[PDB]
């Protein structure tokens, strides 16, 4: 294909970012019916061209062969659109973080340039053409692509995701019309499309055809401005029209509370003078009053229907457009975010545009899924990283309730310094358009709260000039931009990355202060909203209390948003067609950045990390306070009160509930509730009373089904502390002493400690053997994401937890046998140990031991561990063996459910737990240290039954394996089950996940430790 | 109840091994009815003349965190001198004690007691590892005071000029001690971090001769 085309290389000119694309615009539908626009029904003048559709790959733009103009190539395959053509095996998704995917040299692309050539046999009806206009829309083509129709050149167009229109009205016929359309992988525009994500191309969102008449509505704008108490409003609609001016045309504006028409306004075209060559005569505003408007909030998303009717005086509708109204203020005053005049609280998550089978094709279904999940797990914001999105989803948030963070298509991580292009007034342009019409697409949308300016694009002089265009058009909302030290002239809130809650980072130029510490920076006013924070990376969100204590104890830390909601793992097929979870460089792509695009708090498929349920409690609206047998309830809604909310509590003893019961829950928004209790009987038992409360929704919501469980806690009541002594045992264990080993008999029960490694190598029930593996003290665990705190492939911090782990020999330190020695006692046998772990003539460790096995099959563990002041702290201080048991179940007296850590177990409560084996493992896909549960009193696996004060892990794989294995689907059950019991373990941190990020108060540096445990029998 | 607690034994048990005695001993703090504290111990006496005293406390969840775990006793030997490698040379607490250095001191007896004019607890030394008095050595990980002045003296006394010397001298060697506090002096003052709210708490001191 030639001529212009191939010779002017518009795909490498950030001066041409289109040709012949019409003005952006918000969502049209053209309908010709008012009703059908108020129900918000679909409309015969908007056609889908989704579906099956035909494709060729070249390996670059000269070697498309020009006959594909005029006809189908043979060679093509039928494929379905929209779709990336990465998924469909055409080429290699790329996964890389910062670097460029590309060399590097604006404003020139890779001459071996991935071209996809659609194209597309359709029917155009003749009532289509014989008036009017009728345009193509493509909603999203990644990364730019060259239009022709029925052979004739119709335009180009840029940016990945928004919507390029086309006007086709001189180009079709009646009956069969060919589309042709050239997607280049990459352009210009890929310099500005560095967002830390698969790299892929094609196009992946909706086509569809718009006929509008040639007499129109081209664009509208709805605001809403209230009194003080917003008890009163104004809705002003600014309406524009294209085509011939004519005195008998009107526009009337109707405002909609269901079916229940509240206002509506008429007048001819022609503005208010606004300087002294006059106003806009192809412009109409209509101003409506609302009287006690009801509220779009994300707590109660109150919507209105507005409808925008152009049509002639006497009556006669040339069209319809509309939109849903969100009647709500956002302003910044006295350094606070408000939402109709009450400070939010933004408990957010930055969500993709990512499915593991289709790539980054969104579909209605996921969306859906997505923010039902959300609002489950007490999330009301989400920020749209790092595009705008797909237009259903502002659609969905105003209909279910979330605030957005909606943000421009500008990512520029990979140049040095990254501000190189955003400083440049030579890509003011192409920049500016990314923003501008962002703002035009989606300015009706009252999810929308906050514009953001993009992400990771430094801060330069071009953020600026566009910080102050949308503050010019749309004082509506707040702006901001984290670039360039997350506190520039550029944003509206201070808007940091991973900046700590109490640790300074101090880096040169753009430094991350302590959150509470940046509010107070001399002449600092401004609200602080983390636009990321508590990096979800596998297993990860250590600390993440530590935020929501700070959010609610400062009033201008108003939140933040998470990174981040969905892994970007893929579906790859194995040999026998099943399936598995791919990261980077699963595709042959190179460079790449491996598992680093895994940072979810769900899994691709939406199943639930761990690290959600703790997400889910921290974000609680209501919160908890125990005086005696009082229970204060405090909301921390702004606008309901608790009208679908009733709280159930529960005192149990070590597991066995005493009592229950129930009180409707009738809280104002930041109101209290004083819950007294009855008189709890008094247990005729040891041991320790726990309350437990949760909020329970009776009733089904849009979002939830009723029984919906919103919010919990706990607190310790009452202790009794055991004084009565067990009875003295009949039965007296006898000690068998060979030079390889200390016997211990007690029946049919055996204990063998091999005398020259000093460890339990082995125990006997009758003649089944219990162990496959000897029980081994171990200071290490097979490292979390956190700990290799890898962001970059080619980049190693040497202060990472795994780093100094490795080169302090930790995990290659083996035990010293020092003593190993045995006594008997008047009722048992006394077995003393001692080990030292050393690394190059270096003590790590001490271990000293005692075993004290009774009468009545008890065996007693007392652990006594030194640890070297200047060798690193270790991961964990426990005991590890594989038992050759397995077991169906896993029950247990401690905190869980699921998964917890130290720095990650307030979600966790302590109760009686029994869960299926598999349950216990927690399925990452980087495999790595899993499924502890801290907290725990007694633990039961077959035959066995430990007790003390300790974490465990209990599964078939071991430790080795999981530090062994780079996927999950690698993994094979070893033989019999791995336990790990530990009397302390290290906290996973997550605060970032590339530097040491576990808080010192979660390090295991006492230098000395104690735990001890008791083995027996159930 | 934590200043009338009464001590009710458990159990003490006596037995012999290759190279050592062994008492094992557990006792229950009560008050009215209300177990407060137990305590677990084993002392093992060698060949060498040392004897190993391991402690594990149990605190009841719901009774106040106490201000201190550890041992006490009034020796009949007055000497002049005490040596102990640990933080000072003076009296630090452990929410009181980063001016204090890691070092071997030295000081007269007088200068382990700290004369505030009311009289209250004074004169503790943390991160201890040994202490020296008179024949006696003792060795671990503790926190201690010493001086002519038992703790029920010091409470019951509101002047400093009221005190006098007792018999001997009154040691009190903790596992563990509650901070200070004094962030006010008319309010509970101590932070979180320095109370001993953990319920389980383990210590072992080795008694010997020099
Ligand atoms: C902030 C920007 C986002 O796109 C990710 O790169 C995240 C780390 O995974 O940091
Ligand atoms: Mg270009
Ligand atoms: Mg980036
Ligand atoms: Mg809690
Ligand atoms: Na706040
Ligand atoms: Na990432
Ligand atoms: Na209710
Ligand atoms: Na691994
Ligand atoms: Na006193």
New binding site residues.
């Given amino acids: 294909i030639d001529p212009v085309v191939l010779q002017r290389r518009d795909w490498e000119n950030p001066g041409v970012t289109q040709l012949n694309r019409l003005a952006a615009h918000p969502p049209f539908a053209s309908w010709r019916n008012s009703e059908e626009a108020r129900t918000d029904r679909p409309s015969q003048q908007l056609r889908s061209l989704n579906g099956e559709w035909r494709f060729a790959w070249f390996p670059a733009p000269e070697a498309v062969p020009e006959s594909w103009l005029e006809c189908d190539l043979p060679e093509a395959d039928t494929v379905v659109v929209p779709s990336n053509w990465q998924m469909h095996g055409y080429d290699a998704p790329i996964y890389t ?1 910062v670097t460029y995917p590309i060399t590097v040299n604006p404003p020139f692309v890779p001459t071996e340039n991935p071209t996809g050539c659609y194209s597309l046999t359709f029917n155009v009806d003749e009532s289509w053409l014989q008036e009017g206009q009728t345009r193509i829309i493509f909603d999203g083509v990644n990364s730019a692509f060259h239009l022709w129709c029925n052979g004739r050149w119709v335009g180009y167009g840029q940016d990945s995701r928004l919507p390029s229109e086309f006007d086709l009205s001189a180009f079709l016929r009646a009956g069969e019309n060919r589309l042709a359309v050239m997607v280049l992988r990459w352009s210009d525009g890929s310099y500005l499309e560095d ?3 698969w790299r892929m191309s094609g196009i992946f969102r909706d086509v569809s055809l718009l006929h509008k008449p040639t007499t129109q509505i081209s664009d509208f704008h709805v605001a809403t401005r209230f009194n003080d108490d917003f008890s009163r409003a104004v809705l002003e609609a600014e309406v524009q029209m294209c085509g011939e001016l004519r005195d008998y045309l009107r526009v009337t504006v109707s405002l909609w509370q269901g079916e229940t028409q509240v206002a509506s306004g008429t007048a001819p075209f022609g503005g208010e003078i606004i300087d002294e060559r006059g106003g806009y005569a192809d412009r109409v505003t209509l101003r409506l009053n609302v009287e006690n408007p009801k509220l779009w909030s994300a707590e109660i998303p109150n919507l209105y229907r507005a409808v925008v009717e152009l049509h002639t005086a006497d009556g006669t509708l040339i069209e319809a457009e509309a939109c849903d109204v969100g009647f709500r203020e956002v302003r910044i005053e006295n350094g606070l975010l408000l939402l109709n005049g009450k400070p939010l609280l933004i408990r957010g998550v ?1 969500r993709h545009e990512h499915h593991p089978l289709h790539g980054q094709v969104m579909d209605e279904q996921t969306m859906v899924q997505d923010i039902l999940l959300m609002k489950q797990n007490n999330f009301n914001a989400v920020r749209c ?2 595009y705008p999105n797909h237009p259903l989803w502002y659609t969905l948030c105003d209909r279910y309730g979330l605030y957005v963070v909606d943000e421009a298509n500008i ?1 520029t ?1 990979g140049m040095v310094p990254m501000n190189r292009l955003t400083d440049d007034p030579r890509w003011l342009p192409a920049m500016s358009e990314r923003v501008t019409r962002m703002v035009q697409r989606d300015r009706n949308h009252p999810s929308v709260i906050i514009w953001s300016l993009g ?2 694009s430094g801060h330069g002089a071009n953020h600026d000039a566009l910080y102050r265009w949308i503050k010019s058009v749309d004082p509506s909302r707040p702006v901001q931009y984290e670039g360039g030290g997350a506190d520039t002239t550029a944003t509206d809130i201070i808007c940091p ?2 900046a700590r809650v109490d640790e300074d980072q101090p880096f040169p130029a753009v430094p991350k202060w302590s959150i509470k510490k940046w509010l107070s920076l001399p002449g600092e006013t401004r609200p602080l909203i983390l ?2 924070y508590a ?1 979800a ?1 596998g297993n990860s969100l250590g600390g993440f209390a530590k935020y929501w204590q700070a959010f609610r104890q400062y009033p201008r830390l108003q939140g933040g948003f998470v ?2 909601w969905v892994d970007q793992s893929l579906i790859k097929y194995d040999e026998n067609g099943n399936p598995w979870s791919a990261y980077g460089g699963d595709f042959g792509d190179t460079p790449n950045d491996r598992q ?1 695009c895994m ?1 979810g708090l769900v899994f691709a498929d939406r199943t639930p990390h761990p690290a959600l349920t703790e997400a889910k409690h921290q974000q609680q609206f209501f919160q908890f306070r125990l005086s005696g047998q009082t229970i204060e309830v405090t909301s921390e809604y702004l606008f309901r009160h608790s009208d679908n909310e009733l709280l159930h509590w529960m005192v149990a003893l070590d597991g066995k509930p005493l009592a229950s019961g129930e009180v409707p829950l009738d809280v104002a928004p930041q109101g209290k509730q004083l819950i007294e209790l009855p008189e709890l009987p008094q247990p005729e038992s040891a041991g320790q009373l726990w309350l437990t409360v949760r909020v329970v929704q009776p009733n089904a919501t849009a979002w939830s089904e009723a029984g919906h469980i919103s919010a919990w806690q706990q607190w310790r009541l009452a202790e009794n502390l055991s004084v009565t002594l067990p009875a003295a045992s009949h039965a007296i264990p006898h000690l068998t002493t060979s030079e390889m080993d200390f016997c211990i008999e007690l029946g049919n029960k055996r204990w063998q400690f091999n005398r020259q490694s000093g460890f339990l190598s082995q125990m006997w029930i009758g003649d089944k053997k219990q162990l496959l593996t000897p029980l081994r003290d171990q200071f290490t665990r097979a490292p979390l994401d956190n700990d290799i705190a890898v ?1 970059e492939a080619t980049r190693i911090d040497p202060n990472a937890w795994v780093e100094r782990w490795k080169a302090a020999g930790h995990y290659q330190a083996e035990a010293a046998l020092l003593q190993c020695t045995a006594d008997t006692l008047a009722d048992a046998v006394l077995i003393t140990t001692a080990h030292a772990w050393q690394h190059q003539g270096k003590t790590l460790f001490i271990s000293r031991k005692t075993y004290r096995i009774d009468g009545s099959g008890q065996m007693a563990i007392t652990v006594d561990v030194e640890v070297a002041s200047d060798t690193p702290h270790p991961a964990r201080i426990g005991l590890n063996c594989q038992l050759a048991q397995v077991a169906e179940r896993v029950n247990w007296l401690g905190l869980g459910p699921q998964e917890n850590y130290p720095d990650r177990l307030t979600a966790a409560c302590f109760d009686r737990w029994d869960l299926p084996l598999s349950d216990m493992y927690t399925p990452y896909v980087f495999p790595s240290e899993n499924g502890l549960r801290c907290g725990t009193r007694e633990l039961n696996y077959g035959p066995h039954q430990w007790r003390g004060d300790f974490q465990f892990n209990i599964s078939r794989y071991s430790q080795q394996q999981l530090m062994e294995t780079s996927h999950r689907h690698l993994l094979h059950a070893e033989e019999g089950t791995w336990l790990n019991i530990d009397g302390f373990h290290m906290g996973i941190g997550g605060d ?2 590339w530097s040491p990020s576990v808080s010192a108060e979660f390090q295991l540096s006492a230098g000395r430790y104690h735990y001890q445990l008791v083995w027996c029998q159930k």
């Fill in positions: 973080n967002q830390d994500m930055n990283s790092h990512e991580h992400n990771e990355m991973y636009c990321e990096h990376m990174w981040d680093f940072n962001s970032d996940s």
